[PDB]
Amino acid sequence: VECDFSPLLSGTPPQVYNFKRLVFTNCNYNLTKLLSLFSVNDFTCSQISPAAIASNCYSSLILDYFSYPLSMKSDLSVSSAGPISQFNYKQSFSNPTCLILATVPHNLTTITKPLKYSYINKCSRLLSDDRTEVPQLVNANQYSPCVSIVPSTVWEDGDYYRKQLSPLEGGGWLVASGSTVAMTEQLQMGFGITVQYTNSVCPKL
Amino acid sequence: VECDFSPLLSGTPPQVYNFKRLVFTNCNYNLTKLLSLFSVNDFTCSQISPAAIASNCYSSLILDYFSYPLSMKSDLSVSSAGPISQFNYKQSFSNPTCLILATVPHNLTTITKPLKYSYINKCSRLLSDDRTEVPQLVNANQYSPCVSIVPSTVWEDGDYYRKQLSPLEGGGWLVASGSTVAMTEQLQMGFGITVQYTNSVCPKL
Amino acid sequence: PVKRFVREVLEEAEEAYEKRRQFEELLWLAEWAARDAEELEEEIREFEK
Amino acid sequence: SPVKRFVREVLEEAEEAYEKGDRRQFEELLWLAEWAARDANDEELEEEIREFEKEV
Numbered sequence A, B: 001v002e003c004d005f006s007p008l009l010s011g012t013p014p015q016v017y018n019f020k021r022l023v024f025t026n027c028n029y030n031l032t033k034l035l036s037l038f039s040v041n042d043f044t045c046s047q048i049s050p051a052a053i054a055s056n057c058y059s060s061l062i063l064d065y066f067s068y069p070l071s072m073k074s075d076l077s078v079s080s081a082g083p084i085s086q087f088n089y090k091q092s093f094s095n096p097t098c099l100i101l102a103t104v105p106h107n108l109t110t111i112t113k114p115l116k117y118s119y120i121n122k123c124s125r126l127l128s129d130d131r132t133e134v135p136q137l138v139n140a141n142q143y144s145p146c147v148s149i150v151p152s153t154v155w156e157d158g159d160y161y162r163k164q165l166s167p168l169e170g171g172g173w174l175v176a177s178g179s180t181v182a183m184t185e186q187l188q189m190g191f192g193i194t195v196q197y198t199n200s201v202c203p204k205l
Numbered sequence C: 001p002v003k004r005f006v007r008e009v010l011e012e013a014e015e016a017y018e019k020r021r022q023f024e025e026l027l028w029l030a031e032w033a034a035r036d037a038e039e040l041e042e043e044i045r046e047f048e049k
Numbered sequence D: 001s002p003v004k005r006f007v008r009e010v011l012e013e014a015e016e017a018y019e020k021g022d023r024r025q026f027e028e029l030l031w032l033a034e035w036a037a038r039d040a041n042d043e044e045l046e047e048e049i050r051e052f053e054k055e056v
């Protein structure tokens, strides 16, 4: 068959802490055609070349996509140390990866803009007997623990969210903090592609 | 021209994990002349006999020399699985080989002893994607990956050495440990001969 | 932002001790929120009595 | 012991990193220290690492 990229071009892309993930196995992909619809502002690959990402055939392909502002290009990197790589979205270093920052051109008219950009500024777990602030750092290929209390979009830059973790969950509290960035004239999106080397996800023709 | 075993007797012998290698092609050798300069304590060959190692013609000869205490004679043996073969020095299993353990004589006043005998007891790689330790074994005719962080001589028995791998290299840590044995009255050395079968390297007659 | 959250937590704690462990936990959460982000500490001290 | 002199330096580096505000590096450095303390069969050093965690 052919790997399907339709869900990317339908609906409103989620936020960085709710990144939407697609898994592709046993299909034929054309990555150059997917990036043709967009205006790629950034393309940085680790453990693989930007030209070689769309040429090789892989055992599995993983594509996370989200709404991301270009003004935070410094935070979305493997060598970065901002809140994006701690509480929002982390990529595994054991596989070849690529980060793409693109812009939804006006002619693509089925990628609806969100109200604004948002991200988890902090996500801590306040323990009980130890009165200790244990930061909750997100691991690779998983969601943040605070996504359950942070809404789909942070209402105001600096909001605080709390959840009373039950004694069984460890008592104490789970606290988060939200931040926002102003929406741009054209929607800007971020993609993260992770490739895993029987190779059945091959380029078409 | 005679094959020159000059670098053996013109400096301090290195350690087992920093073995010094000489390659000989198109020359006449007199192996018994070399061993007559030492006090051979052990001589064991694999895929060849000790009498025929110094009589046949070979396409190429390789000699790896290092410092090695005789109290660890069991670890230096093609069919061992101690830390010496796993992490320090391993010979090829396809070509005829020989291991010689010798003692520097008193009249050999051109060889300087090191402070002590040192080796690598562990060389492992730590992965932060799952927090897993994988030992780093040594391939034939190659140095250990941990030789860049373990110094020329291990200062204390049980030291630990660390090195952080970059996001491109895979992240995590590279960790090694050193072990020491006290110097004896006379420096004791180890040699490893690898012979590959035009057979230009013929013995001097 | 922080001030409204702290005020809401204090208002919740007020109707708990009068209605103790929950009050202490809520006060600890409010103190942590105030410390993480001036007048909030003064409000906490005033509510303590 | 040659293991304590290694864990102490690792803990000092982790403390400096946490003062700098890099939580990922602190989590990585704290992992190496306990890995070394567990490979060297030293429960005391393990307890000292836990106490350092509590104090930070």
Ligand SMILES: *[C@@H]1O[C@H](CO)[C@@H](O[C@@H]2O[C@H](CO)[C@@H](O)[C@H](O)[C@H]2NC(C)=O)[C@H](O)[C@H]1NC(C)=O
Pocket (backbone or CB within 6 Å): A030, A031, A032, A033, A034, A036, A204, A205
């Ligand atoms: C993969 O996608 C790329 C981009 O859409 C395709 O490239 C175009 O192909 C058409 C038809 O051959 C050409 O007229 C265009 O000039 C090509 N564009 C570029 C930038 O090269 C490519 O053909 C697709 N491959 C497959 C197998 O369908």
Ligand SMILES: *[C@@H]1O[C@H](CO)[C@@H](O[C@@H]2O[C@H](CO)[C@@H](O)[C@H](O)[C@H]2NC(C)=O)[C@H](O)[C@H]1NC(C)=O
Pocket (backbone or CB within 6 Å): B030, B031, B032, B033, B034, B036, B204, B205
């Ligand atoms: C190679 O070196 C050895 C010494 O290690 C030489 O051996 C001596 O040879 C003479 C002459 O045959 C004998 O009288 C000695 O008894 C030998 N000494 C030993 C220790 O065996 C040998 O001759 C050399 N070979 C060549 C061809 O030069």
Ligand SMILES: *[C@@H]1O[C@H](CO)[C@@H](O)[C@H](O)[C@H]1NC(C)=O
Pocket (backbone or CB within 6 Å): A105, A106, A107
């Ligand atoms: C959209 O496509 C139309 C039709 O080709 C073209 O005229 C127009 O310039 C395009 N707009 C942009 C912003 O590229």
Ligand SMILES: *[C@@H]1O[C@H](CO)[C@@H](O)[C@H](O)[C@H]1NC(C)=O
Pocket (backbone or CB within 6 Å): B105, B106, B107
């Ligand atoms: C070293 O050579 C001298 C030469 O006079 C000799 O007397 C001595 O015994 C030799 N030492 C040995 C063989 O250990």
